[PDB]
């Protein structure tokens, strides 16, 4: 159980700053170089910044240089990224990664799940969630008009895995996103077993169990 848990992402306005944190456990953190890599949405991996075990040497991607400041607290066993003067295309999922061997001349051998950072002067708006009701049958939930991403959606408190499809969100005219999650279940149920989509949109701090 090696672990790297990022935190600190969210909505931030153009020009402003964010501090990303990354908590390390499993391995001996004090001993390794660490990296920050990021990915815009649907775009490719981009390396950002690296720092050695003892903060002795730092490196930045021309692409930040004078805006981002990598650092670490070997006592707290934690890694940081201070991001400043943000712009729309600093918008991305940001990962911390551990280095495989000793040396910075080593591959990244483990990466966190990452945190989304969204750079935008639009306010958060929580979704409204609507039921989509109907051999096999299909049902689902329509998760409409929310900002920013992500929302997550499980069915029956995670009990229901087979047959689930959660579609990528689409940006609407309005400037908000829309989602739809669905499941396929026997037509025979329905009037027997109950179905519940559990939506959670943190940035707005709302949960809804819509109950189809």
């Amino acid at each position: 159980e090696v672990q790297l848990v990022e935190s600190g992402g969210g909505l931030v306005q153009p020009g402003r700053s964010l501090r990303l944190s990354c908590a390390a456990s499993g391995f001996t953190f004090d001993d390794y170089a660490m990296h920050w890599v990021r990915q815009a949405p649907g775009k490719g991996l981009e390396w950002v910044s690296a720092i050695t075990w003892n903060s002795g040497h730092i490196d930045y991607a021309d692409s930040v240089e004078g805006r981002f400041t990598i650092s670490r607290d070997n006592a707290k066993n934690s890694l940081y990224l201070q991001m400043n003067s943000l712009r729309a295309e600093d918008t991305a999922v940001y990962y911390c990664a551990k280095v495989s061997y000793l040396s910075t001349a080593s591959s990244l051998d483990y990466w966190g799940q990452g945190t989304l950072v969204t750079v935008s002067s639009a306010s958060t708006k929580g979704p409204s969630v609507f039921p989509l009701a109907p051999g096999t049958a299909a049902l689902g939930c329509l998760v409409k008009d929310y900002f920013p991403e992500p929302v997550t959606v499980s069915w029956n408190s995670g009990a229901l895995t087979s047959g689930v499809h959660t579609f990528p969100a689409v940006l609407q005219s309005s400037g908000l996103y829309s989602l739809s999650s669905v499941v396929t279940v026997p037509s025979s149920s329905l009037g027997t077993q109950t179905y519940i989509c559990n939506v959670n949109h943190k940035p707005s701090n709302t949960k809804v169990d819509k109950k189809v």
């Binding site: 990296h35 890599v37 490719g44 991996l45 981009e46 390396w47 690296a50 490196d59 991607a61 021309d62 990962y95 495989s100 910075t104 001349a105 080593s106 591959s107 990244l108 051998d109 483990y110 990466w111 966190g112 799940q113 990452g114 409204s128 609507f130 039921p131 989509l132 009701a133 109907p134 096999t136 049958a137 299909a138 689902g140 329509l142 409409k144 499809h165 959660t166 579609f167 990528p168 969100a169 689409v170 609407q172 829309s178 739809s180 669905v182 396929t184």
Partner: protein, 211 residues
């Protein structure tokens, strides 16, 4: 410092031998690594030191190269290998990545299953109508969804969304959403999605009544 890969994309069949190249702009000896990223997940390390496998990684991933020219080979493409692969220089700063290589899979053509959903009454209360059409577990990606309201073709008012390619059976899924206000939605009876796909000798059409 650039890293370039080709192809940027490739389809191939289960069993096939896939080849991905990576060209460093300046001699990196063997400080090269290969990463796979499945859609939804975080990247895994497959190969390092140009040709060394990460532990627990299946042998069918193979790497060769030295200097500037490098190659990832997957020699028996399995359905779980659908992802995007990235090379990375790590001899020195910058620790730059290639552009990525999406790899998509086989397969024999498969028909969608089409379902229709009206807008819930809790939503017309809200002031607007969303009609949703669902295409399920088909291949290939290509699919045409024509909406029809009182047999009227409908244009400029649907959005679409495709799930990424299933790891198990190599299929896609589509949802289409027809949005129109309570004004128009109350004005008609028959809403319908005509679905057109290669796995269907004729189009299939789902529909419902009320409004």
């Amino acid at each position: 410092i650039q890293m370039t890969q080709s192809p940027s994309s490739l389809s191939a069949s289960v069993g096939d031998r896939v080849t991905i190249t990576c060209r460093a702009s300046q001699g990196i000896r063997n400080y090269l690594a290969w990463y796979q990223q499945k859609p939804g997940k975080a990247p895994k390390l497959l190969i390092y030191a140009a040709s060394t496998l990460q532990s627990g990684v299946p042998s069918r991933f193979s790497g060769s190269g030295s200097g500037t020219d490098f190659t990832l080979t997957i020699s028996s493409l399995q359905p779980e290998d659908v992802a995007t692969y990235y090379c990375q220089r790590y001899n020195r700063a910058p620790y730059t990545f290639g552009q990525g290589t999406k790899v998509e899979i086989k397969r024999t053509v498969a028909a969608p299953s089409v379902f229709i959903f009206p807008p819930s009454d809790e939503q017309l209360k809200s002031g607007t109508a969303s009609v949703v059409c669902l295409l399920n577990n088909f291949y290939p990606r290509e699919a045409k969804v024509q909406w029809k309201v009182d047999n009227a073709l409908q244009s400029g008012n649907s959005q679409e969304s495709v799930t990424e390619q299933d790891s198990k059976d190599s299929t896609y899924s589509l949802s289409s959403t027809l949005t129109l206000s309570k004004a128009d939605y109350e004005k008609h009876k028959v809403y319908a999605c005509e679905v057109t796909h290669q796995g269907l000798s004729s189009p299939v059409t789902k529909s419902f009544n009320r409004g």
